Design a protein around this motif. Sequence first.
Motif, PDB file in Angstrom:
ATOM      1  N   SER A 135       0.389  -1.387   0.344  1.00 26.34           N
ATOM      2  CA  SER A 135      -0.117  -0.004   0.157  1.00 26.34           C
ATOM      3  C   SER A 135       1.180   1.457   0.044  1.00 26.34           C
ATOM      4  CB  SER A 135      -1.197  -0.228   0.868  1.00 26.34           C
ATOM      5  OG  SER A 135      -0.401  -0.812   2.397  1.00 26.34           O
ATOM      6  N   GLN A 136       0.181   2.196  -0.717  1.00 28.20           N
ATOM      7  CA  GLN A 136       1.406   3.830   0.141  1.00 28.20           C
ATOM      8  C   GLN A 136       1.300   3.893   1.424  1.00 28.20           C
ATOM      9  OE1 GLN A 136       1.125   7.559  -3.429  1.00 28.20           O
ATOM     10  NE2 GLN A 136       1.580   5.215  -4.532  1.00 28.20           N
ATOM     11  N   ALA A 137       0.720   3.355   2.374  1.00 26.68           N
ATOM     12  CA  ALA A 137       0.095   3.448   3.352  1.00 26.68           C
ATOM     13  C   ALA A 137       1.048   3.770   4.606  1.00 26.68           C
ATOM     14  CB  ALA A 137      -0.625   2.609   4.269  1.00 26.68           C
ATOM     15  N   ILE A 138       2.062   5.506   4.589  1.00 21.18           N
ATOM     16  CA  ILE A 138       2.892   5.849   5.114  1.00 21.18           C
ATOM     17  C   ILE A 138       2.768   6.007   6.292  1.00 21.18           C
ATOM     18  CG2 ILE A 138       2.186   7.807   4.063  1.00 21.18           C
ATOM     19  CD1 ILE A 138       5.844   7.521   4.125  1.00 21.18           C
ATOM     20  N   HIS A 139       1.252   6.068   6.335  1.00 22.02           N
ATOM     21  CA  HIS A 139       0.882   6.633   7.592  1.00 22.02           C
ATOM     22  C   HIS A 139       1.034   5.338   8.630  1.00 22.02           C
ATOM     23  CE1 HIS A 139       1.064  11.015   7.916  1.00 22.02           C
ATOM     24  NE2 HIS A 139       0.406  11.355   7.357  1.00 22.02           N
ATOM     25  N   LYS A 140       0.684   4.466   8.285  1.00 23.06           N
ATOM     26  CA  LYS A 140       0.594   3.306   8.856  1.00 23.06           C
ATOM     27  C   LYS A 140       1.449   2.417   8.936  1.00 23.06           C
ATOM     28  CE  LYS A 140      -4.190   1.987   7.090  1.00 23.06           C
ATOM     29  NZ  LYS A 140      -4.924   0.796   5.903  1.00 23.06           N
ATOM     30  N   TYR A 141       2.505   2.666   7.905  1.00 28.06           N
ATOM     31  CA  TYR A 141       3.806   2.049   7.791  1.00 28.06           C
ATOM     32  C   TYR A 141       4.408   2.507   9.144  1.00 28.06           C
ATOM     33  CZ  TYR A 141       8.599   2.736   7.004  1.00 28.06           C
ATOM     34  OH  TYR A 141      10.035   2.979   7.534  1.00 28.06           O
ATOM     35  N   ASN A 142       4.003   4.009   9.318  1.00 25.10           N
ATOM     36  CA  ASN A 142       4.630   4.927   9.934  1.00 25.10           C
ATOM     37  C   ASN A 142       4.113   4.226  12.173  1.00 25.10           C
ATOM     38  OD1 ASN A 142       6.095   8.190   9.598  1.00 25.10           O
ATOM     39  ND2 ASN A 142       6.910   6.246   8.886  1.00 25.10           N
ATOM     40  N   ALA A 143       3.157   4.101  11.639  1.00 24.58           N
ATOM     41  CA  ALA A 143       1.977   3.193  12.968  1.00 24.58           C
ATOM     42  C   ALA A 143       2.523   1.656  13.205  1.00 24.58           C
ATOM     43  CB  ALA A 143       0.591   3.103  12.924  1.00 24.58           C
ATOM     44  N   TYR A 144       2.729   1.290  12.441  1.00 20.03           N
ATOM     45  CA  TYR A 144       3.410  -0.092  12.508  1.00 20.03           C
ATOM     46  C   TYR A 144       4.638  -0.141  13.550  1.00 20.03           C
ATOM     47  CZ  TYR A 144      -1.144  -2.876  11.142  1.00 20.03           C
ATOM     48  OH  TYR A 144      -1.628  -2.847  10.454  1.00 20.03           O
ATOM     49  N   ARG A 145       5.074   1.039  12.796  1.00 21.00           N
ATOM     50  CA  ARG A 145       6.605   0.431  13.647  1.00 21.00           C
ATOM     51  C   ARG A 145       6.856   1.498  14.125  1.00 21.00           C
ATOM     52  NH1 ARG A 145      11.275   4.779  10.554  1.00 21.00           N
ATOM     53  NH2 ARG A 145      12.716   3.615  11.702  1.00 21.00           N
ATOM     54  N   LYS A 146       5.936   2.586  15.291  1.00 20.64           N
ATOM     55  CA  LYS A 146       7.168   2.852  16.251  1.00 20.64           C
ATOM     56  C   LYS A 146       6.449   1.989  17.520  1.00 20.64           C
ATOM     57  CE  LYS A 146       2.357   3.964  16.598  1.00 20.64           C
ATOM     58  NZ  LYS A 146       1.486   3.935  16.661  1.00 20.64           N
ATOM     59  N   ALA A 147       5.025   1.578  17.091  1.00 17.64           N
ATOM     60  CA  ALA A 147       4.463   0.396  18.342  1.00 17.64           C
ATOM     61  C   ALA A 147       6.159  -0.984  18.669  1.00 17.64           C
ATOM     62  CB  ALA A 147       3.658  -0.420  17.854  1.00 17.64           C
ATOM     63  N   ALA A 148       6.259  -1.383  17.449  1.00 20.42           N
ATOM     64  CA  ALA A 148       7.439  -2.456  17.294  1.00 20.42           C
ATOM     65  C   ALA A 148       8.831  -1.590  17.272  1.00 20.42           C
ATOM     66  CB  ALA A 148       6.833  -3.257  16.005  1.00 20.42           C
ATOM     67  N   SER A 149       8.736  -0.732  18.258  1.00 16.81           N
ATOM     68  CA  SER A 149      10.183  -0.035  18.188  1.00 16.81           C
ATOM     69  C   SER A 149       9.677  -0.348  20.050  1.00 16.81           C
ATOM     70  CB  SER A 149      10.429   1.667  18.178  1.00 16.81           C
ATOM     71  OG  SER A 149      10.081   2.017  19.480  1.00 16.81           O
ATOM     72  N   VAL A 150       8.123   0.293  20.130  1.00 15.74           N
ATOM     73  CA  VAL A 150       7.782   0.216  21.871  1.00 15.74           C
ATOM     74  C   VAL A 150       8.192  -0.946  22.752  1.00 15.74           C
ATOM     75  CG1 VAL A 150       8.095   2.453  21.305  1.00 15.74           C
ATOM     76  CG2 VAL A 150       5.763   1.583  22.450  1.00 15.74           C
TER      77      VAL A 150
END
Length: 327
Positions: free
Chosen positions: A22-37
Motif C-alpha cells: 500500500s502506499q500507506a506511509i501513515h500506517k507504515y509509520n504506525a506499525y513502526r513505533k509500536a514495534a519499537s515500543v
Amino acid sequence: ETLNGGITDMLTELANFEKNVSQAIHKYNAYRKAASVIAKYPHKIKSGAEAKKLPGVGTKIAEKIDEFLATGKLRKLEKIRQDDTSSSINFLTRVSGIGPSAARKFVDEGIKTLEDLRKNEDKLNHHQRIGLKYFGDFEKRIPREEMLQMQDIVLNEVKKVDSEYIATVCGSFRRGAESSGDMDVLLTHPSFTSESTKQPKLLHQVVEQLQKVHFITDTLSKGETKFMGVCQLPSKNDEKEYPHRRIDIRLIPKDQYYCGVLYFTGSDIFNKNMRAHALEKGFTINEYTIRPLGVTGVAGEPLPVDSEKDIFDYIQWKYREPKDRSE
DNA sequence: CATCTG
DNA sequence: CAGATG
Ligand code: NA
Ligand code: NA
C-alpha cells in the motif's frame, strides 16, 4: 530483544507491507513505533489490553496482538504472504533502482519476474538496466579477500593521479568484517574544502582513471561529489572471473573528512554512544563536524580535525581502532 | 542528501 | 520542477 519477539516481528512484517504494497506511509509509520515500543518493553506482554496501555499502541494493533497471542498466526499476515501481487512487489524492488513505486507500475503492466523484466528491458532506465543485468552478482556478498584486492587497486590509482588525494574505504571493511555488501571510498583533497569553491575534476579525474584501468565497468550515476557505479576485479588467467560489484565514490572537503570517515565507519551503535557521550563532554556531532556545545541551549563553531584521533580526544576518549568500534 | 527522469 | 532511488 526476545520476550516480545513475535510481537515486534509481526509488527514489522505489517509496517512493511504498508509502506511497500500500500502506499500507506501513515500506517507504515504506525506499525513502526509500536514495534519499537513493545520492543523496548520489559514485560512479557500477555494481552492486547496490556499492550494497548502503551503509546503507539492503539486499538488496531492491540487487536492484532490479541489474535496473534491467541493463535500462532495472524490472517492478514497470511493473506499478504500468498498474494501474488504483494509478492511481486517484494521481488521487483530487489532490483537496483526498482523502488516500490516502480514495483507497482510494473506489476500492473504485469511485469512480475526477471523474465518479465528482461522481456521489457526497454521500459526500465539505465539504472534498472544494470540492475537487472547484474542481479545475481549484486546479491552476493563481497569477501574481504576481494575487498583487499579492490581497495589495493583503487588506492594505487588515486595516488597515481595525484599524490595529494586521500582515500579511505569505510564500512564494515574498515572494522575487520570478513565480508562486505558494496564498496565505498571516501575521497578528499587538500585543495577541497568547506570554503574552497569546488574542484569537480577532483571527483571525475579519479573516476576516469578507474575506467582507464577498467575497474569501474559502468556508471550508475555521477555527479559533482558523489558517484555510484559497478566494478570488477580482473580475471586472472582465464578460468575464474569476478562478479560485478557495487561501488560508491564521494568528495569531501578536507575539513570534514574525519567526521564523515568516522561516521561512515560505524557501527551505528558505536556512533550514538560516541555521540551520546560527546554530548556529555559538552559537544555535538554529525557526519561533518564536532562543535563546541554552548549552554544557552545550543551552540556551534567547528572544532578542528586531523585524524579520527582529534575528535575522540575532543570528547576525551579512548581512541578506538576500527576493529573495536562495534559498540 | 545527492543524482536522475522526464 | 516533483518525485523517486539509493
Ligand atoms: Na530496489
Ligand atoms: Na505532493
